[PDB]
Amino acid sequence: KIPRGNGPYSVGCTDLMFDHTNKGTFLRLYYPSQDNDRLDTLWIPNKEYFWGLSKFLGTHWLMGNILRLLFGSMTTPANWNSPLRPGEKYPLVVFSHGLGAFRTLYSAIGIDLASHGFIVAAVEHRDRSASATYYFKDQSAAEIGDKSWLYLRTLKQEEETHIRNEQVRQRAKECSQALSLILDIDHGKPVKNALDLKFDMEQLKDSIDREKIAVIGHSFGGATVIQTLSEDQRFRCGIALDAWMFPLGDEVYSRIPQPLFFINSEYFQYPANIIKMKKCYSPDKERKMITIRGSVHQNFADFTFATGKIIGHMLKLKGDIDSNVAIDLSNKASLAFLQKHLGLHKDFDQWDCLIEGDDENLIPGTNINTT
Ligand SMILES: Cc1ccccc1-c1cc(Nc2nccs2)ccc1C
Ligand SMILES: [Cl-]
Ligand SMILES: [Cl-]
Numbered sequence: 001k002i003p004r005g006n007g008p009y010s011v012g013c014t015d016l017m018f019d020h021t022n023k024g025t026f027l028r029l030y031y032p033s034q035d036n037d038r039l040d041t042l043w044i045p046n047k048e049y050f051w052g053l054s055k056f057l058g059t060h061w062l063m064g065n066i067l068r069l070l071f072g073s074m075t076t077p078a079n080w081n082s083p084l085r086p087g088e089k090y091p092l093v094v095f096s097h098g099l100g101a102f103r104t105l106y107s108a109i110g111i112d113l114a115s116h117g118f119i120v121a122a123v124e125h126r127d128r129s130a131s132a133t134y135y136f137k138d139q140s141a142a143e144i145g146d147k148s149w150l151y152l153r154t155l156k157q158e159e160e161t162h163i164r165n166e167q168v169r170q171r172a173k174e175c176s177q178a179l180s181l182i183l184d185i186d187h188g189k190p191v192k193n194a195l196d197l198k199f200d201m202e203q204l205k206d207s208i209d210r211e212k213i214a215v216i217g218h219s220f221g222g223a224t225v226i227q228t229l230s231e232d233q234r235f236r237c238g239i240a241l242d243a244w245m246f247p248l249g250d251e252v253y254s255r256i257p258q259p260l261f262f263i264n265s266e267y268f269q270y271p272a273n274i275i276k277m278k279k280c281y282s283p284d285k286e287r288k289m290i291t292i293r294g295s296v297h298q299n300f301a302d303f304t305f306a307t308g309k310i311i312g313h314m315l316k317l318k319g320d321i322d323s324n325v326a327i328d329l330s331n332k333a334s335l336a337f338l339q340k341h342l343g344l345h346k347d348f349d350q351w352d353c354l355i356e357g358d359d360e361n362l363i364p365g366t367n368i369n370t371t
Contacts, residue, residue, distance in 0.1 A: 002076040005115020010036040012082030020142035020194035022135045028103040030110035030120035038079035052132025056100035076107040089209040095122040096217030096224035102130040112331045127167040128153035168247035172227040212342040218300040223247045230255040237341035245276035253279040259286035259341040265295035274368045291363035294321030
């Protein structure tokens with residue numbers, strides 16, 4: 001089970017695609033909900049995500065069918081299409097998924113953020129870093145729900161530097177474009193969702209605290225955080241969850257004026273990666289780094305809750321730390337960081353000491369010795 005949020009708000013979930021093309025925005029929205037009696041949200045909504053996943057894992061597409069058999073009816077505890085809780089402007093997080101992932105796979109994070117009074121836009125990237133994604137060739141195809149699927153691109157070694165850097169830049173543009181979409185919906189612009197869903201986007205009118213905007217992401221998405229901040233000053237701070245820094249151009253490192261928080265797993269990180277994180281440091285910049293003791297790369301994704309302890313450890317989906325314990329640390333330290341750098345009037349400062357890595361399951365800074 002994906003954990004429910006720890007916050008006081010009930011959580012709703014919906015999908016938004018606008019426009020309908022490969023260049024439009026696709027996001028999953030997590031939001032404080034009025035009601036708490038809807039159907040739970042389907043975690044992986046289409047068979048083709050499973051084909052994509054099994055390509056990314058390097059198995060036959062028929063393994064996709066077995067993954068579908070095992071995981072295809074799994075839900076996440078968010079009220080599908082629930083009405084948005086009224087009477088309050090909400091801060092906004094744009095969320096970027098890792099390589100081989102897609103918009104739905106960080107609901108433990110998205111639900112928890114939403115339960116504390118955030119609207120969360122988890123983008124689905126069309127850079128061919130997702131396992132799978134879909135869009136519509138044209139208006140006719142959108143109208144009859146005739147989906148065109150785009151699958152993960154495998155790179156030759158010669159393509160790595162260049163294609164990863166082209167992808168992190170498209171990712172950033174996709175994050176800004178998602179933000180401008182939500183801001184326009186907030187500023188009342190009528191938008192026709194390319195998905196025929198029973199959630200009126202008009203609910204989102206006057207619902208965003210327009211100055212309180214952050215960008216968060218895991219792995220490839222953690223590099224997207226940094227690229228996004230350097231390109232789009234509307235984002236006021238970012239949190240890179242076990243960022244994979246390789247996609248970033250040399251030019252970005254001196255170009256990040258916003259506060260930036262690195263939350264790392266113990267077992268993923270390596271010198272080349274930590275050196276790149278340290279290249280983001282400057283005495284006039286706000287920078288923080290913590291490491292979750294006992295944790296693996298996938299402790300930030302929902303896959304860490306999808307299996308039992310033994311199979312989980314085997315598939316490197318779980319570390320020595322309990323998954324609920326690890327995500328609570330990452331989500332609480334994130335909440336405190338967001339309160340500080342967005343100027344929120346909540347009680348998230350109760351977790352300020354986690355920003356400093358002051359917990360029995362936290363390492364301040366990094367365990368990684370560089371030079
Ligand atoms: C646990 C699980 C559930 C539903 C589909 C796939 C998996 C799975 C996932 C990984 N890891 C990944 N990390 C990023 C993308 S896929 C490994 C193994 C399995 C079975
Ligand atoms: Cl790892
Ligand atoms: Cl290294």
